[PDB]
Design a protein around this ligand. Structure first.
Ligand SMILES: OC[C@H]1O[C@@](CO)(O[C@H]2O[C@H](CO)[C@@H](O)[C@H](O)[C@H]2O)[C@@H](O)[C@@H]1O
Ligand SMILES: *[C@@H]1O[C@H](CO)[C@@H](O)[C@H](O)[C@H]1NC(C)=O
Ligand SMILES: *[C@@H]1O[C@H](CO)[C@@H](O)[C@H](O)[C@H]1NC(C)=O
Ligand SMILES: *[C@@H]1O[C@H](CO)[C@@H](O)[C@H](O)[C@H]1NC(C)=O
Ligand SMILES: *[C@@H]1O[C@H](CO)[C@@H](O)[C@H](O)[C@H]1NC(C)=O
Ligand SMILES: *[C@@H]1O[C@H](CO)[C@@H](O)[C@H](O)[C@H]1NC(C)=O
Ligand SMILES: *[C@@H]1O[C@H](CO)[C@@H](O)[C@H](O)[C@H]1NC(C)=O
Ligand SMILES: *[C@@H]1O[C@H](CO)[C@@H](O)[C@H](O)[C@H]1NC(C)=O
Ligand SMILES: *[C@@H]1O[C@H](CO)[C@@H](O)[C@H](O)[C@H]1NC(C)=O
Ligand SMILES: *[C@@H]1O[C@H](CO)[C@@H](O)[C@H](O)[C@H]1NC(C)=O
Ligand SMILES: *[C@@H]1O[C@H](CO)[C@@H](O)[C@H](O)[C@H]1NC(C)=O
Ligand SMILES: *[C@@H]1O[C@H](CO)[C@@H](O)[C@H](O)[C@H]1NC(C)=O
Ligand SMILES: *[C@@H]1O[C@H](CO)[C@@H](O)[C@H](O)[C@H]1NC(C)=O
Ligand SMILES: *[C@@H]1O[C@H](CO)[C@@H](O)[C@H](O)[C@H]1NC(C)=O
Ligand SMILES: *[C@@H]1O[C@H](CO)[C@@H](O)[C@H](O)[C@H]1NC(C)=O
Lengths: 223, 305, 214, 181
């Protein structure tokens, strides 16, 4: 078995290049072939290419040919994906994947095209937008009441939201972010609570945005 | 075709342009006939950083089946054939004729053992360009065939009694050459590429690498029924025509079966300033020109008009 | 140029029942067909390769069949953990140009549940910024299909709202949805009544939540 | 006589060049005519030599008329004369493999001694010169000794071995401990 660990999220301007990596450990590196697969937000899986590690030979999807390069460093058991001349539509999670091919070093090679082992994925955001933290606005409050926070105008993804420092989880809905026409993201987090609890129990949404190094705590009151 | 009366002619099987022609022809048949999924050849024109040439192409599974080929005289030339039944291949031939073409030669590509070729008419024959040079290949021509039956299930079979008998006859020929007081010892390949270290051949379109240790593990002048050699079909192959690598798709047939006749061997002897009275011989091969030589030794091409 | 097509796009199955997923290729791919499972926020997981060989660690209730251009993934009895997106993958061509289907989403089928609808006016802090977001919340409904419409002063709005929907709830198997209307402060203070109209199978008549600005 | 000096544990490449830029038949042997390595057509062969598992060539160069003997993890006993036979020519090269170690571990006290021993093949008489970080230099044949280390001798020492006009360089790390006066 091999474990695949990928490099951290990237944020790029259109026109830039990106190089993402994938460290394979646990088995014999040259007995595996490695494949890169991407997934744009909301979309399906797209095969980018595959490297026959023992031969140092890579093959690419036609729509990518020319601006994608897959390499492998045998000395550090690391696979690399380089994508050039980035476009906004290159925004996606990039997965490294691999499969055992047989005793390749003894000339056995099945040339398997399916993918058994997968990395955790790398988010690559390609946008003209500049990094910025969210503005957090209250969604102020029948037997149950709804309340929440609006987390607006940040870039890039992701943002995380908790309530009462993780003390409140029941009935919480934190929505997937939407991309605004400004190129900035926006999401709401909501929670439904007993209506008799307003005025006594205080509700605070905690918002964290690592990319901008921002942390906001917003109290949401009846009025 | 026509026996030249009272004519003496010099042959040299080690410097024979017919061998070169056949080599180029077989190499071409293979390029056009066998297509690897990927082939790699080096290119390091002293520029510094190398640039491997990579070709990727459709990879159809096709059963290869060597067909006899005849060589007739090239325009402006004639083929002389030596008739001496036990001609060593290099020297004056007194009984020589002119022929229209060579006999039908099966272009079998293999290492270690020569398969499906011509047998010596009289006794076992051994040939070398220089027996004193340990680095030169020794070509053995048997006078009796030995069957070797191989399967894609991972082994080859050879009758132990027949193999023993042929080893005895080869060893007798070897000490007749190196010293009648010599213990003749057969050992496994010393090493190198897999195509060199094992008995390597193609069967049903697949490349077999069979461990020949059990065939070359005896001492002369000093279970037991069939010899079963463990085999492996491989997909990544070192090229024989030039330096490079080729990758083929896995087998699609569950019943790969070949029976061949062993008709000769390619051997190398261990050199050394060891004043021991024993010669060590190991299976060799790899230069397919030696395979072609084993059949073409009795022919030469001469300029006429 | 081998196109993989999966049907249907969404399959709703009652817990513990059989599910059958289909994959079609635009030309033969022999038996070089793999199936993957993917849950939200995670990498895909290999279930089946060679059309019918179960990958290691995959329960016996998953079964693959077919060859050529027509394939089936069968799950014998759906467990809580089997609800996911499923992808097929062709790997027959050489030189390799491998391709994926667009996926089948396997969802939990439950009885109809009407949304609880809440509306939020823009905060004073946001109005101080010069912009006004109005949020409409549809809470805990089933099935996922809901129509939401914004009306400002009875006038139907278009092009100025965005929707987001949660993944299916792990506990009650419902969905929730937010709809956010955004206008500048100037356009906001130019109108009076802000209303969110909700259409859904669980409701007998469209539901309107509203508030009067100021 | 072409001479190449080697370092124990290191890799050495012995060169052999043919008259034309083409892959032809070559073979490397040692002084006793033991086959080391060569080609058969486009395949590599290895002889029954003690170098077997550590010997190689660079086949990507054969096409360029170059047929090197590469030997990894050198041993002192690898020292010998090697002959490349190619196109009826015989290119000879003497390989000398040396090793240099410190008799006692690197971690030493001020005022303590350091001894370096040169490992050499039979028949070779090399000169050695070592130099500490502070500029302290010592010379000898097989064994070099400093009787008292200074704190300033802590670090990388550089030793040069001279043999047959050629030389090789060794670097040895030596630790000399400080203390509170
Ligand atoms: O290389 C593009 C190729 O991939 C496919 C499926 O294998 O579509 C993938 O990429 C598309 C474009 O980014 C996505 O829309 C889709 O979700 C993803 O599966 C083929 O449709 C396409 O030809
Ligand atoms: C050469 O051929 C002739 C004609 O047959 C024959 O008489 C002769 O004996 C042959 N050899 C010699 C040298 O006599
Ligand atoms: C391959 O290498 C050769 C020689 O260095 C050079 O002429 C050629 O441009 C190289 N091709 C690539 C892909 O860089
Ligand atoms: C082989 O050829 C030689 C001449 O080189 C000839 O004298 C001899 O008769 C031949 N060998 C035999 C005995 O068949
Ligand atoms: C074999 O070798 C000896 C080499 O000196 C040669 O003279 C002889 O003719 C060759 N072949 C025969 C005819 O036996
Ligand atoms: C030459 O070969 C012929 C057959 O091809 C044979 O009849 C004859 O004995 C040979 N010549 C002699 C006398 O050596
Ligand atoms: C084969 O040649 C050997 C001599 O090497 C001989 O003993 C044997 O009789 C020959 N076999 C037959 C009968 O053809
Ligand atoms: C035959 O090989 C020996 C041993 O290597 C060598 O001394 C001799 O030169 C070779 N003979 C010829 C004519 O090349
Ligand atoms: C090889 O197969 C043949 C029949 O094709 C058989 O006669 C022979 O006995 C076999 N030889 C073995 C197993 O050594
Ligand atoms: C022949 O083979 C037998 C086994 O059948 C073996 O014991 C012996 O070594 C061989 N005979 C000799 C000495 O040639
Ligand atoms: C080959 O197999 C033999 C037994 O048949 C074994 O002793 C030897 O180590 C093996 N070596 C190779 C060439 O793989
Ligand atoms: C080689 O064969 C002999 C029989 O001649 C056998 O006794 C010995 O064990 C074999 N060596 C191995 C295991 O390779
Ligand atoms: C091998 O030769 C023997 C005897 O000539 C014959 O019985 C057999 O058919 C031959 N086998 C093959 C595959 O050519
Ligand atoms: C030897 O010839 C037989 C046909 O008689 C064939 O079955 C076999 O494939 C041949 N061997 C090789 C390696 O070509
Ligand atoms: C016996 O053979 C060995 C190698 O096999 C050789 O080096 C030696 O000179 C010979 N003499 C002895 C020690 O019997």
């Amino acid at each position: 078995e091999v474990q695949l660990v990928e490099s951290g999220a990237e944020v790029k301007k259109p026109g830039s290049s990106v190089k993402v990596s994938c460290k394979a450990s646990g088995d014999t590196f040259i007995r595996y072939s490695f494949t890169w697969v991407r997934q744009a937000p909301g979309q399906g899986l797209e095969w980018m290419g595959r490297i026959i590690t023992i031969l140092d030979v890579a093959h690419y999807a036609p729509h990518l040919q020319g601006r994608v390069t897959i390499t492998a460093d045998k000395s550090t058991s690391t696979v690399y994906l380089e994508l050039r001349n980035l476009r906004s539509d290159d925004t996606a999670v990039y997965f490294c994947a691999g499969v055992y091919e047989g005793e390749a070093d003894e000339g056995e090679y099945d040339n398997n095209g399916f993918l058994k082992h997968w990395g955790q994925g790398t988010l690559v955001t390609v946008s003209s937008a500049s990094t910025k933290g969210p503005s957090v606005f209250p969604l102020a409050p029948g037997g149950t009441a709804a309340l929440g926070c609006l987390v607006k105008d940040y870039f890039p993804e992701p943002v995380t939201v908790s309530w009462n420092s993780g003390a409140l989880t029941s009935g919480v809905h934190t929505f997937p972010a939407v991309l605004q026409s400004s190129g900035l993201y926006s999401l709401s987090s909501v929670v439904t609570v007993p209506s008799s609890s307003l005025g006594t129990q205080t509700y605070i949404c905690n918002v964290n945005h690592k990319p901008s190094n921002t942390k906001v705590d917003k109290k949401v009151e009846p009025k | 075709e026509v026996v030249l009366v009272n004519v003496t002619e010099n042959f040299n099987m080690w410097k024979n342009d017919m061998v070169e022609q056949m080599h180029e022809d077989i190499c071409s048949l293979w390029d056009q006939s066998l297509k690897p999924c990927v082939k790699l050849t080096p290119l390091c024109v002293g520029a510094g950083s190398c640039n491997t040439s990579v070709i990727t192409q459709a990879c159809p599974k096709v059963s290869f089946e060597p067909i006899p080929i005849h060589y007739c005289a090239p325009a402006g030339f004639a083929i002389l054939k030596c008739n001496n039944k036990t001609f060593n291949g290099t020297g004056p031939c007194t009984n020589v004729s002119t022929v229209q073409c060579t006999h039908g030669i099966r272009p079998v590509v293999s290492s270690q053992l020569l398969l499906n070729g011509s047998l010596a008419e009289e006794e076992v024959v051994i040939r070398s360009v220089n027996f004193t040079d340990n680095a030169k290949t020794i070509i053995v021509q048997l006078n009796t065939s030995v069957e070797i039956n191989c399967t894609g299930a991972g082994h080859c079979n050879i009758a132990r009694a027949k193999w023993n008998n042929t080893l005895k006859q080869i060893a007798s020929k070897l000490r007749e050459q190196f010293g009648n007081n010599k213990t003749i010892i057969f050992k496994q390949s010393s090493g190198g590429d897999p195509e060199i270290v094992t008995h390597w051949f193609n069967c049903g379109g697949e490349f077999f690498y069979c461990n020949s240790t059990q065939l070359f593990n005896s001492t002369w002048f000093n279970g037991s029924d069939t010899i079963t050699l463990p085999c492996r079909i491989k997909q990544i192959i070192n090229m024989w025509c030039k330096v490079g690598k080729a990758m083929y798709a896995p087998p699609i047939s569950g019943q790969i079966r070949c029976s061949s006749n062993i008709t000769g061997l390619l051997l190398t002897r261990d050199g050394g300033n060891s004043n021991n009275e024993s010669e060590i011989f190991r299976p060799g091969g790899g230069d397919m020109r030696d395979n072609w030589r084993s059949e073409l030794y009795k022919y030469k091409v001469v300029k006429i008009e | 140029d081998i196109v993989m097509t999966q049907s249907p796009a969404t399959l709703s199955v009652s817990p513990g029942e059989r599910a059958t997923l289909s994959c079609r290729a635009s030309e033969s791919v022999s038996s070089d067909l793999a199936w993957y499972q993917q849950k939200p926020g995670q990498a895909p997981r290999l279930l089946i390769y060679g059309a019918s060989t179960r990958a290691t660690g995959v329960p016996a209730r998953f079964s693959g069949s077919g060859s050529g251009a027509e394939f089936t993934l069968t799950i014998s009895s759906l467990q809580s953990e089997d609800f996911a997106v499923y992808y097929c993958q062709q790997y027959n061509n050489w030189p390799p140009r491998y391709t994926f289907g667009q996926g089948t989403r396997l969802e939990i089928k439950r009885t109809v549940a009407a949304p609880s609808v809440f509306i939020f006016p823009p905060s004073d802090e946001q109005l101080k910024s010069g912009t006004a977001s109005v949020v409409c919340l549809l809470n805990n409904f089933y099935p996922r299909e809901a129509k939401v419409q914004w009306k400002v002063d009875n006038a139907l709005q278009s092009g100025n709202s965005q929707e987001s929907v949660t993944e299916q709830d792990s506990k009650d198997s419902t969905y929730s949805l937010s709809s956010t209307l955004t206008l500048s402060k100037a356009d906001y203070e130019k109108h009076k009544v802000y209303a969110c109209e909700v259409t859904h199978q669980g409701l007998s008549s469209p539901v309107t939540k509203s508030f009067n600005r100021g | 006589k072409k001479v190449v000096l080697g370092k124990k544990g290191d890799t050495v490449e012995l060169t052999c060049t043919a008259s034309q830029k083409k892959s032809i038949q070559f073979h490397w042997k040692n002084s006793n005519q033991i086959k080391i390595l060569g080609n058969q057509g486009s395949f590599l062969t290895k002889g029954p030599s003690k170098l077997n598992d550590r010997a190689d060539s660079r086949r990507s160069l054969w096409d360029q008329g170059n047929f090197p003997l590469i030997i990894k993890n050198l041993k002192i006993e690898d020292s010998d004369t090697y002959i490349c036979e190619v196109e009826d020519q015989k290119e000879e090269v003497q390989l000398l493999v040396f090793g240099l170690t410190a008799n006692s571990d690197t971690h030493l006290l001020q005022g303590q001694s350091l001894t370096l021993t040169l490992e050499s093949p039979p028949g070779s008489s090399p000169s050695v010169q070592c130099r500490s970080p502070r500029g302290k230099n010592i010379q000898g044949g097989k064994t070099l000794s400093v009787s008292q280390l200074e704190l300033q001798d802590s670090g990388t020492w550089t030793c040069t071995v001279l043999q047959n006009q050629k030389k090789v360089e060794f670097k040895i790390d030596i630790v000399v401990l400080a203390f509170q006066k």
